[PDB]
């Protein structure tokens with residue numbers, strides 16, 4: 085019995101099947117009252133909602149799924165026919181994410197890819213029929229934000245206007261990624277100050293819009 089398994093069971097027993105809003109609410113209730121978990125949370129989740137609504141992306145890539153919280157949060161705002169691809173290297177987390185999406189009724193909109201982003205990113209064009217990404221949500225190992233961004237560019241996966249949205253740029257922090265995008269002529273950045281999920285600790289999201297080479 086793991087924390088992630090307890091979060092999934094709590095959702096299944098305290099949310100309505102096929103209702104993504106009740107799913108997010110049960111996850112946020114559980115993590116506020118019972119056990120903290122590394123889901124994006126409601127404070128950063130609200131900023132993520134505002135960004136999704138502004139861009140209405142047709143194809144989103146998320147790096148790091150955990151329990152499926154951010155996938156549910158993004159997929160519930162996607163337009164009919166829009167898709168989300170989420171890469172999760174932990175197989176136990178990938179199985180929880182799948183079941184979470186299944187319960188929320190969003191399974192048709194999301195594809196969970198169980199594996200390392202550095203291995204999966206180069207397969208996106210040929211195997212997954214991807215041309216370019218409309219948006220990327222970075223929420224995996226913090227030291228992978230910068231190499232995976234550089235890898236997405238190399239693979240031709242970024243277009244003029246691709247929205248990169250990075251969680252935890254303050255806590256645990258992503259200093260090399262943050263310095264790079266803020267210093268590059270190929271990105272237009274915006275910092276969205278917020279709070280670490282379920283905590284009175286300052287955190288933030290960085291939006292970095294790819295401008296081409």
Ligand SMILES: Nc1ncnc2c1ncn2CCOCCNC(=O)c1cc(-c2ccc(F)cc2)cc(O)c1O
Nearest residue numbers: 122148171172173174199200201223224225252255256
């Ligand atoms: N395909 C892939 N390739 C490479 N890596 C991959 C992958 N797929 C998954 N992973 C690994 C991603 O799993 C964990 C990443 N998330 C976090 O580490 C995280 C940590 C905190 C936190 C913890 C403790 C504190 F005290 C304060 C804050 C908060 C957050 O919001 C976080 O997101």
Ligand SMILES: [K+]
Nearest residue numbers: 123124153154
């Ligand atoms: K999450």
Ligand SMILES: [Mg+2]
Nearest residue numbers: 124223251252
């Ligand atoms: Mg995070």
